[PDB]
Design a protein around this ligand. Structure first.
Ligand SMILES: CCCCCCCCCCCCCCCC(=O)O
Length: 133
């Protein structure tokens, strides 16, 4: 059941994004611009295929996937990773693997807001998105 995640979402709060990017080895200039960027995330479904767009003034990404089926992904910071997205406890869990490393991108709905928690190493970033009508 993925349906409550679907729609267009705008960033309205961010904690520790610099820590997370730094852990991934993102350079200072990219971190600088990213810390000021407020992306729009669009999640749409067509049958079993989900498409997740992230749009901003800095970088844009798009992925399509089926839940529970691995896919190749090239992230906004240019990592080539092996990914899988699944539902766990009602949360949308996106796991990326590369070079023996892992990061998780966990999305949960709390009071109608979409909370994205990104973990790599010890770094934990929490970003809050609100739904656009
Ligand atoms: C597509 C906009 C990405 C802006 C950040 C660019 C540099 C760091 C990328 C780290 C991995 C992706 C982070 C996604 C954060 C989010 O969706 O709010």
């Amino acid at each position: 059941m993925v349906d409550a995640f679907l729609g267009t979402w705008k960033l309205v709060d961010s904690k520790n994004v610099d820590d997370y990017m730094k852990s991934l080895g993102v350079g200072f200039a990219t971190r600088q611009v990213a810390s000021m960027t407020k992306p729009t995330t669009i999640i749409e479904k067509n049958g079993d295929i989900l498409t997740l767009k992230t749009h901003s003034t800095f970088k844009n990404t798009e992925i399509s996937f089926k839940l529970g089926v691995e896919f190749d992904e090239t992230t906004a910071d240019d990592r080539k990773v092996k990914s899988i997205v699944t539902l766990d406890g009602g949360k949308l869990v996106h796991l990326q693997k590369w070079d023996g490393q892992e990061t998780t991108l966990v999305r949960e709905l709390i009071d109608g807001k979409l909370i994205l928690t990104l973990t790599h190493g010890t770094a934990v970033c929490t970003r809050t998105y609100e739904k656009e009508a």
